[PDB]
Design a protein around this ligand. Structure first.
Ligand SMILES: NC(=O)c1cn([C@@H]2O[C@H](CO)[C@@H](O)[C@H]2O)c2ncnc(N)c12
Ligand SMILES: [Ca+2]
Ligand SMILES: [Ca+2]
Lengths: 70, 542
């Protein structure tokens, strides 16, 4: 997988990681989803995150996001 | 993972909102990608280009802008440009202000002491124009005048333009237009649909930021299905048809694994989504009527090329930013020889006319059957012959289409029920639209009683629904279906000819319009201090 594709995936990740701390929180995911007109619950946000969060710390980092995208 | 649906739509909407934001979403290196050649690299173009006024200075959008720039450097020519702009304004002016704007055009341009008198339009033709102004003026009043204006411009002004820096600059844009179109020209976004020989996805020209749809026809899949001639035919019809109501082709190119059609992106999504994923199934008769009228116009445009569409179904009708529709997928369209019938059992279950199901010979009639299906389904929120997601055998659907009467609810006005039953007449010889007047018979049906088709075809009626530019009117990306991989298939040198015939690259008028729309033309079309020659136009050296 090319550096091109990694860089694009990184830009997509930065669309969620709005503070750039390297993680996607439920708060950040909820902000994106509400900009799509959805109204997820805190538990729905946690479920979606947990599906991607491999090491179980409750947020998504860029390696986990990349594994999902590829 | 569910997050993928969110990522796909968030990324697509970021691209659609003018990219990252600045450069309008153009690549950071877009001026390098579209860098003009030095004028000395255009010699062959200069030698081979056909010096035809009508093409160079009017029908090619960039050539028209460059000829107008040249004219605006000459006081005696800018008056003629002004006059053509006022004629264009007059052509789109409502009929009760027509008289007065025509009067203003007359006194501004066509009297010997008018402030911007244009002497090269015949005084006698002016008097004729004056006389027909005073007795019911119509939109095409000044055509003859405009004609005479172009007839002056195609002579000495044209020949001076050909020797000017503005024609050299046109040759540079034409060089850019013919550069290779490759995978790297574009960036691919989420898949929007599946079918035919591959799938359709949102994509973007990297240099300009302009969004399009990319229909990807997989080479191995074409070869396994022996679909080479079908793929070529779809491309050629798309290129030849130029209709407001059919998706248009802007590029055709090749990849290692695919042949790609680059098409008008339709950001309002498809009508199947609006029927079933926007609240209660179906929508109101006002909407269905408007969409029906525009679909009928699109069918009429295809039938004028003696092309039968054959694939009408809600999925194939798309909505643009303004809420107007276009017919999309032409993979089943066929040109019928003048005066003849064709044979071909093609289409989708529940949408094939009886004469298609029976494998009879047929002409344009299946498209009027399909229009009947579309109106029925828009109003009812259901196929005429299949329950919404009814687990029903295709044999049973075929049986119902051949044998059973479709049933109408309270949702149908008497006129809507009438036009549906007349279009869903099972015997084609008695079907609405299939008589002498062809589409004209449909246009005067009382279902369309309050539809002015002339204003619709001129784009003067507002659609009843305008899509949210920040919404994705499409199934989530994980829910798009997918072909299985093609197997034991081997691309040869024997397909190379076919590929070369298909991969003709940019389509000239859509490409120049893309450059204008994205303001790549405005931002790149610059000169030196005080309008002097920039180095790329300066013959002396780079
Ligand atoms: N062939 C085309 O021009 C298009 C097909 N689709 C989608 O792909 C589906 C077909 O698989 C349609 O119902 C649309 O959702 C499109 N979506 C947007 N623009 C287009 N120009 C198309
Ligand atoms: Ca964060
Ligand atoms: Ca984690």
């Amino acid at each position: 997988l090319t550096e091109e594709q990694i860089a694009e995936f990184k830009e997509a990740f930065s669309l969620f990681d709005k503070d750039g701390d390297g993680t996607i929180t439920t708060k950040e995911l909820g902000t994106v989803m509400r900009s799509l007109g959805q109204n997820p619950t805190e538990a729905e946000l946690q479920d979606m995150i947990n599906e991607v969060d491999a090491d179980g710390n409750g947020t998504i980092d860029f390696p986990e996001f990349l594994t999902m995208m590829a | 993972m569910e997050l993928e649906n969110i990522v796909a739509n968030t990324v697509l909407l970021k691209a659609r909102e003018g990219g990252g934001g600045k450069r309008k979403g153009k690549s950071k290196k877009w001026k390098e990608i579209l860098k003009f050649p030095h004028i000395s690299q255009c010699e062959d173009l200069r030698r081979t280009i056909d010096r035809d006024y009508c093409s160079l200075c009017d029908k090619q959008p960039i050539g028209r802008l460059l000829f107008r720039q040249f004219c605006e450097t000459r006081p005696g020519l800018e008056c003629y440009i002004q006059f053509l702009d006022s004629v264009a304004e007059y052509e789109v002016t409502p009929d009760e202000k027509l008289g007065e704007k025509g009067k203003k055009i007359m006194t501004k341009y066509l009297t010997p002491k008018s402030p911007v008198f244009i002497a090269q339009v015949g005084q006698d033709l002016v008097s004729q124009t004056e006389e027909k102004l005073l007795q019911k003026p119509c939109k095409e009043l000044f055509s003859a005048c405009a004609q005479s204006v172009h007839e002056y411009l195609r002579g000495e002004p044209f020949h001076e333009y050909l020797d000017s820096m503005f024609f050299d600059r046109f040759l540079q844009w034409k060089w850019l237009e013919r550069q290779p179109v490759t995978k790297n020209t574009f960036r691919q976004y989420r898949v929007l649909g599946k079918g035919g020989f591959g799938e359709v996805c949102a994509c973007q020209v990297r240099a300009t930021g302009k969004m399009y749809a990319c229909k990807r026809l997989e080479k191995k899949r074409i070869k396994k299905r022996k679909g080479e001639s079908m793929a070529l035919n779809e491309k050629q019809i798309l290129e030849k048809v130029n209709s407001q109501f059919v998706v248009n082709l802007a590029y055709a190119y090749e990849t290692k694994d695919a042949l790609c059609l680059v098409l008008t992106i339709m950001n309002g999504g498809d009508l199947k989504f609006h029927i079933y994923n926007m609240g209660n199934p179906g929508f109101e008769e006002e909407r269905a009527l408007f969409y029906a009228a525009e679909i009928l116009c699109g069918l009429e445009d295809l039938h004028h090329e003696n092309t039968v569409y054959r694939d009408l179904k809600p999925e194939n009708i798309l909505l643009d930013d303004y809420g107007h529709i276009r017919i999309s997928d032409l993979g089943l369209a066929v040109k019928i020889p003048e005066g003849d019938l064709i044979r071909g059992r093609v289409g989708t279950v529940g949408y094939m006319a009886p004469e298609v199901l029976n494998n009879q010979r047929y002409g344009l009639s299946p498209d009027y059957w399909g229009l009947g299906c579309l109106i029925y389904e828009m109003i009812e929120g259901q196929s005429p012959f299949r329950g919404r997601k009814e687990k029903v055998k295709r044999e049973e659907v075929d049986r119902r289409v051949l044998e059973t009467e479709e049933v109408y609810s309270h949702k149908f006005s008497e006129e809507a029920k009438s036009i549906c039953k007349m279009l869903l007449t099972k015997d084609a010889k008695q079907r609405l639209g299939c008589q002498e007047e062809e589409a004209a018979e449909v246009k005067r049906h009382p279902f369309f009683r309050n539809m002015n088709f002339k204003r619709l075809e001129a784009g003067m009626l507002d659609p009843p629904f305008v899509p949210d530019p920040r919404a994705v009117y499409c199934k989530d990306v994980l829910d798009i279906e997918q072909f299985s991989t093609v197997k034991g298939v081997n691309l040869d040198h024997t397909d190379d000819d076919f590929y070369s015939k298909f991969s003709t690259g940019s389509v000239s008028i859509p490409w120049q319009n893309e450059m204008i729309e994205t303001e790549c033309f405005k931002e790149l079309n610059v000169f030196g201090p005080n309008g002097t020659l920039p180095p790329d136009l300066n013959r002396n050296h780079p």
